[PDB]
Symmetry: D3
Subunit: 233 residues, 6 copies
């Protein structure tokens, strides 16, 4: 076991969906999986394994923030032998071409974190997903008729930004939304030779000032869930 | 409401104890509080209001890492009007001056995070607790027979450090242990003119590699809990 | 009509292949295009407009280094209305996962330059290609039986490096090779909202110390020229 | 002897007060100490030993800036075996919580210097004083009826600031005033396992642009001298 | 013998003139040297060797940007044993002490590049020319009747700047103009124990927006070519 | 007047010599000047005006460290209208190109301080002296028969260094010696459009560990004082 997962080894399938919200994890396990069992629950961070259309899949929560995500992704890879990690989270739009409930594929993850400078010689690590997972999602979304918005996200240490006047420059550089784990997911997967991709649904628009309740951040995003299950199966 | 706390404005007392683990927050409420009320549970992150020896007190989980801690503390101060915040968490010792079960009062929280450079003009913010809160802890500690270890902590973005060979330097400069939220608690409380303190129980030693039994984990925790509740009442 | 390009507005087609070496640009206009006409030659940096399988293509040299490349693709995009930019260049491999003759698709370009911190708020810009260009590249490579090697490159300010002891860490973090322009191309195309992608041919390999002859230095470069011209056509 | 102190080993009591101004040091010796004796004068940086209420106290000037303060307290600790160092200096208020003539106790010392990043792995060292001196100062102030103002200082490399528009932000983050040495004193004492504390007399207000007259400066200074002598004896 | 120069070892005289533009290199060989042969032309970057007033002089293009310049200057020194490198280029004035046609000698080259921090311990390398070279330049200019404008230059990674509001700050700090190589030339010559100096002809004034007509630029370059050839002979 | 200088305006001649140590300022005034008057003495930092070869010259101490130097030369320039500032200090040699007794002329001053980054856009300020002063120093040393060692120095925030491993790299990049103020003198004079130069006497060699006796220290210093006075008249 690990200090943050109390599952047995072999309890996780090699493919894992990830959310920050363990209650979103639990909702997916009960609604979309067959024969799902809760396999971990340290610090209330639920994880499950079940079957979707006969194929096995696991779900794990990773909390909020690069440091929290990095903790769970490292243990998933190093102890429980997960090899493919699909984050399906939420994000706050900064592009005007993206609206609430849009699905964003993160083809790179910029950050105001220092974690990647610490990892990578104090230079610029360009944190990116595994291309093949990235193409599976494009194909699967095409096949399901999901309009996937494709671009960079900005992975921040701040949910309440101190740099709102910089959102326009970020959008200009093809950052579609802000979220808080993708750079941590991408850089840890790169460190440990795993395959990762981040999808995110727009729960907030940071320009036009719309938002979603804590409840509809669990249940307004079924298209993203089905997309993730379908491409892992 | 806020996106991460579904309490009603007025449900929190102006004094709040904090843990990273929402189950540890749960342990405190069932074992030590009267009239304990669950007031929030977004993302399984639990918070409570109850009474200790007739005095109102709140409890809130904040998750792992500076980014996550910053979210909850920002919302507790800005929206729920919490004024005093006492973190009681776990840590890994790096100093020969402290051993397993020791309680550490963090008079400074160094960090490898970039969050305070972003906050504080790209300069060095010296993240520190409120002095009257630290004095109150020290007087209550002496009055209970607890021997406080008092020095800096190092709040890291990494649970799995890439710089273990630097722990000696950290301990040279009076860093007693490593945790992952203190700097975030301290900087947020400084930003928003609130009073904060971090207490940490040594649950592992990262140099001697000693750890505690899950049984001993709890009585050490019980000492820190009573100290915390006695300070606040 | 710009300081570094003396063509006339309109001389360039909206699609354009790029190399550092302007004699490869010259080589491609003479060997693969019909009606090859040289439109610019400031500072001996040659550009052409031709046709391949009937469709107008342009070519341009961008020089060595992020700063040179940035000057050229800036002026291409802003004044000469270019919209797609496909750099095809040579690199030194550092990863065990690629051998010589291999073609690399850079899904991200890390860097030791400061240019992106200057562009992007002193934060970490994940410099990435346009996704539909890298999709077009994947499909066209599939169709011509080329096995694209897909990962990050490291765009350095240094040809003669001072950190050769770090090439392993780069390759561990999925950096397949080193070159000197991708990060600038990707950032500039992001800034000015044009589509860009960088392909690289494994000229030599800086860990195996292996290389091979100038006659083979041209077969592998021919493969990449065809892939590039096919996907733009 | 050292390159900046020409006293004999043993000429310093293990407790030492410090000012930047050596004429302030001399003033303290003449007006408050019995059997006062000059013991060093290299570079006109005067130091003294003497007695207050029959107990031995030393006094030393340390000049202006972190660099100069660091030299003198490194030599006091390593060569002359000073164990407790109490800086009593002047400062410029930036916070509406203090006014002219106030005494500040610096529980933290932020900085725009690079010195702590060179000492401390390019991370953020939170430069803090020894807690028992802090407590001794708190108690002695109460005993004397002094209202001690407690928070951070900003130790700058600049007396004539280039960032006067950031003063409100610094005050927001609980920086009560600016001086030029407390961060060096704190970091050097942490490096060398000594006890240090910084007190400051507000002799200027950098926001209102008012300063204490010469005579008021001397009165404010006398209160701090008495507090310092009372707590060291 | 080097990947970027295809001359035999010995084609270069130990003194070399450099320009960014290899067609400026050519023009100097054809109009000013006797017995001028071409010695290198990889990537269309022309070098020559010839005679001026009976004495040997070489010419070498270095391309645009510090990374390009560092490649050529590194190979000139290390392989072709060049010992003195005189760079003569164009630049955009920012200071009111200089006008168009003025010739500038860079007694320092500031920079927004990271190359010198990578080279020099992540500190500030103050990149400067060889003093004896700068003394020849000065005495020769006096003999020829040229009024040299002497001060710092700012070597940028950007022809198209993102900090035009800061040109006034640069000019206040004795930066006479902006160009893109001197800092790389100076740093590389310092690393490898060679003598380097940069002269620059004011083509534009980025403040007054004034520019030179062609011819007028050709005649300003000529004054600098002769200064450069006289001081090497 | 100013907070660190109590002379009256007009008490300083426009030319002024500087040492870190005010007692050396005093020695110069008493041994080398006629009609010497002490004009300032705040904080025991002595300054003088007097005659040499019938011409007026001033002298001022500036303390140890960039921060302290910056204070004094800002006030000398802005309030007392000093226009030429010639620092004559002592230094620790690190290069094999120089031995004891040597006099170094600093054509640039590198640093580990953040002061210039804070002054200069967080880029690399190359801190340099006024060329005409350095030309005067060269010609006067020629006439006086002094052999000038000419190159960079490294201005450090540290007398007791944490980076002795790196002295050889510094010496490779033409840093002949280490001292603690040249970078601040140069940067402030640039800021405020004054003429500055630093000369340093080699009194210790930090590599060969050799040092001058006290007697030889004053003979070397007297050489440099005569050079300074002669070039200032
Ligand atoms: O508004 C946001 N900012 C940062 N991360 C987020 N994740 C969901 N919404 C947001
Ligand atoms: O071992 C530790 N390291 C980092 N964080 C921790 N939190 C509890 N223990 C530790
Ligand atoms: O080794 C290399 N480094 C950078 N660019 C290159 N292009 C060919 N080889 C290399
Ligand atoms: O204005 C101030 N700034 C810095 N240090 C000071 N010491 C007294 N006043 C000041
Ligand atoms: O005008 C200029 N600005 C920036 N870089 C340059 N390189 C040549 N001229 C210029
Ligand atoms: O070696 C030294 N280092 C820094 N400053 C000095 N001043 C005299 N010697 C030295």
């Amino acid at each position: 076991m690990t200090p943050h997962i109390n599952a047995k080894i072999g309890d996780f399938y090699p493919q894992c969906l990830l959310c920050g919200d363990p209650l979103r994890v639990s909702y997916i396990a009960k609604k979309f999986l067959q024969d799902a069992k809760e396999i971990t629950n340290v610090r209330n961070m639920l994880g499950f394994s079940g079957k979707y259309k006969g194929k096995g899949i696991s779900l794990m929560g990773h909390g909020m923030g690069i440091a929290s995500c990095t903790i769970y992704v490292t243990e998933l890879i190093k102890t429980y032998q997960v090899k493919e990690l699909l984050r399906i989270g939420t994000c706050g739009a900064i592009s005007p071409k993206v609206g609430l409930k849009d699905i964003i594929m993160a083809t790179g993850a910029s950050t105001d974190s220092k974690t990647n400078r610490v990892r990578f010689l104090n230079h610029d690590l360009s944190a990116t997903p595994d291309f093949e997972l990235s193409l599976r999602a494009y194909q699967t979304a095409k096949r399901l008729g999901i309009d996937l918005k494709i671009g960079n996200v900005f992975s921040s240490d701040f949910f309440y930004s101190f740099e709102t006047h910089a959102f326009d420059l970020m959008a200009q550089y093809n950052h579609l939304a802000i979220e808080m784990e993708a750079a941590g997911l991408y850089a840890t997967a790169m460190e440990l030779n795993a395959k990762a991709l981040c999808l995110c649904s727009v729960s907030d628009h940071l320009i036009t000032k719309e938002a979603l309740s804590p409840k509809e951040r669990i249940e307004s995003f079924d298209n993203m869930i089905i997309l993730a299950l379908e491409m892992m199966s």
